[PDB]
Design an enzyme around this catalytic site. Sequence first.
Site, short mmCIF file in Angstrom:
data_model
loop_
_atom_site.label_atom_id
_atom_site.label_comp_id
_atom_site.label_asym_id
_atom_site.label_seq_id
_atom_site.Cartn_x
_atom_site.Cartn_y
_atom_site.Cartn_z
N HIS A 65 28.39 5.05 31.95
CA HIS A 65 27.32 5.94 31.26
C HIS A 65 27.92 5.91 29.78
CE1 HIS A 65 30.35 9.40 31.77
NE2 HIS A 65 30.33 9.28 32.85
N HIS A 95 35.35 8.67 23.55
CA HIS A 95 34.34 7.86 23.85
C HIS A 95 33.07 8.23 23.12
CE1 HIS A 95 33.75 11.69 25.60
NE2 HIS A 95 32.36 11.67 25.55
N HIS A 97 28.68 8.42 22.08
CA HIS A 97 27.01 8.71 22.81
C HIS A 97 26.28 8.09 21.72
CE1 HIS A 97 28.43 11.85 25.62
NE2 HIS A 97 29.32 12.12 24.87
N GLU A 107 24.63 13.93 19.83
CA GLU A 107 24.23 14.97 21.15
C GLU A 107 24.31 16.48 20.17
OE1 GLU A 107 27.59 14.54 24.05
OE2 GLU A 107 25.55 13.80 25.33
N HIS A 120 33.50 11.29 20.45
CA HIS A 120 34.12 12.61 21.03
C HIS A 120 35.58 12.20 21.59
CE1 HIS A 120 30.14 14.18 22.59
NE2 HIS A 120 30.32 14.53 21.21
N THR A 199 29.44 17.72 28.08
CA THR A 199 27.96 17.20 27.95
C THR A 199 27.57 16.54 28.88
OG1 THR A 199 28.54 15.58 26.37
CG2 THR A 199 28.20 17.79 25.40
#
EC number: 4.2.1.1
Length: 261
Positions: A65, A95, A97, A107, A120, A199
């Site tokens: 993911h 990591h 997003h 996010e 993050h 999250t």
Amino acid sequence: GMSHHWGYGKHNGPEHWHKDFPIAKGERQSPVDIDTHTAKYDPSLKPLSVSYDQATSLRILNNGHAFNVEFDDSQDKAVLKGGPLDGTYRLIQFHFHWGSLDGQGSEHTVDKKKYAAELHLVHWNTKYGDFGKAVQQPDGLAVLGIFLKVGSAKPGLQKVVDVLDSIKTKGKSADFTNFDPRGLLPESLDYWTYPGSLTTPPLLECVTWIVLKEPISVSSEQVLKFRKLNFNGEGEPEELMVDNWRPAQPLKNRQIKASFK
Ligand SMILES: NS(=O)(=O)c1ccc(CC[n+]2c(-c3ccccc3)cc(-c3ccccc3)cc2-c2ccccc2)cc1
Ligand SMILES: [Zn+2]
């Protein structure tokens, strides 16, 4: 989590998470939209202390993911403290997003503005001994969030971009030593902070969020590489790893504080 099946697709995405993780509709969920005009300057906030000089990275992993750059957190070497935090938080991994288009991917949002991606840097409170125990505490984690916009390349990110070819699919990992996370920080450490959660499932409400106001710029080619990763494992139908972000959740009974005027 050998039976988890959540993801970001149409049938297992964020709007479905609450069935297996009821805390998804909780009182302090993340991310959130940061309304810059309502966030109040808090003069009592201390300057943030990011001490990454001794950070020791170990490996980079595609977990299905996102991809995580993991650090050796068996000693106090890369720590975050100060700001809204009491105590010392140790860096365990970072990591990102990101989106399928430059117009989305982050996010947290700023006055509803979506950035191309969000970094993050995850830290756990050393008073709890280890990461697993920390996530069970309301002040167990401190996640430093940094927005990415597309423009000039970020030199410090290129080592990450170049190794992605080797971890294209879920479950693949690669040695990733001597990576300096200081190369991913913007100039200013001005930030917004609020109490929130992880999250992604288990969505535990254990995070003090610290989101930097200044985004870093990465090149189109750099983020393009992120989008070539796969959510699937080797030998399975290819599904590009894009749009692995959770949308803004209700602020409910929370105030977002600003470290700057
Ligand atoms: N986005 S965030 O708010 O910064 C956040 C930080 C930590 C976590 C938990 C870390 N984590 C991630 C994880 C999640 C997101 C990014 C990287 C790793 C995956 C598995 C995983 C599960 C199944 C298969 C493969 C990987 C597990 C965990 C995790 C859970 C709780 C305790 C320890 C690890 C979740 C969200
Ligand atoms: Zn994250």
